[PDB]
Amino acid sequence: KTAVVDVKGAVANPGVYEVAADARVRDAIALAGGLTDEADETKVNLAAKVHDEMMIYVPKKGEGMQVAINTATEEELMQLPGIGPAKANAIIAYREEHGPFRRVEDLLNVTGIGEKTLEKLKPYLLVP
Amino acid sequence: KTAVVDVKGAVANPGVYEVAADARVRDAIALAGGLTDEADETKVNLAAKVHDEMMIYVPKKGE
């Protein structure tokens, strides 16, 4: 009636814990100390039951799926919503002319990326 | 009672190790110096039971 689970990912104390088979993913994460500041509880089923030998992975915002605007290529840049050849090549032109981007809001200074455009792009970015 | 396993992949010291049959993959990988900075931790279950002649391959990120 006991389960051994590998609680890893964006949890405070990742390890191999021992809990009751009637426990649920939330309990195992609670025992592990909660979520780190980079976790994404969106993609975790906190209600799912625990079984022995189970692996509980908590991914981080991204996941991987983040394009580093400062060090991306035209092919990688235009992989995001809206950004195409000319919009991707202006973000790269601004990269090389007026320097790299400090924050996500620096994209607003690029021609073609307005407030509407930036909103459908924020969660897929990685601005050093 | 005894289980011999081959720990390969993104571990500090891959190779053959001996473990108790009642052990988990956590123990086998602890004997090899644990994972490395390039191990795809999402591809390794340390709560898994170990059996004799078992091969434990830890893939890298990007494989």
Residue numbers in the entry:
A (entry chain B): 62 to 124, 143 to 207
B (entry chain A): 62 to 124
Quoted passage from the original study:
ComEA, a DNA-binding protein widely conserved in transformable bacteria, is required for this uptake step. Following this contact with the tpilus, the movement of tDNA into the periplasm is driven by its interaction with the widely conserved periplasmic protein ComEA. A ComEABs contains an N-terminal transmembrane region, a previously unidentified OD, and a C-terminal DNA-binding domain. We show that this domain drives ComEA oligomerization, and that oligomerization is required for genetic transformation.
In contrast to ComEABs, in the ComEAGs structure there was interpretable electron density corresponding not only to the OD (amino acids 62–124) but also to one DNA-binding domain (amino acids 143–207) per asymmetric unit, which contained two OD protomers again arranged head-to-tail. Because there is no interpretable electron density corresponding to the ComEAGs linker region (amino acids 125–142) of either protomer, it is unknown which of the OD monomers in the asymmetric unit OD dimer connects to the single modeled DNA-binding domain. In fact, we could model the DNA-binding domain in the ComEAGs structure only because it made fortuitous crystal contacts. Similarly, in the ComEAGs structure, examination of symmetry mates reveals that the two-membered asymmetric unit uses the OD multimerization interface to form a kinked-ring spiral along the crystallographic screw axis, containing 12 head-to-tail protomers per turn. A slight tilt between ComEAGs protomers has minimal effects on the ComEA inter-dimer bonds, but it causes ComEAGs to form a kinked-ring rather than a closed ring within the crystals. ComEA oligomerization interface amino acids are conserved and mediate conspicuous intermolecular interactions between the OD domains of ComEA protomers, e.g., the side chains of ComEAGs Arg85 and Asp113 (corresponding to ComEABs Arg83 and Asp111) which form intermolecular salt bridges. The ComEAGs X-ray crystal structure revealed not only the structure of the OD, but the three-dimensional shape of the ComEA DNA-binding domain. As predicted from sequence analysis and noted previously, the ComEA DNA-binding domain structure contains two helix-hairpin-helix (HhH) motifs. At an intermediate concentration of 31.3 μM we observed both monomer and dimer, and were able to fit the sedimentation velocity data to a discrete monomer-dimer equilibrium model, resulting in a Kd of 33.8 μM (95% confidence intervals: 19.3 μM, 48.4 μM).
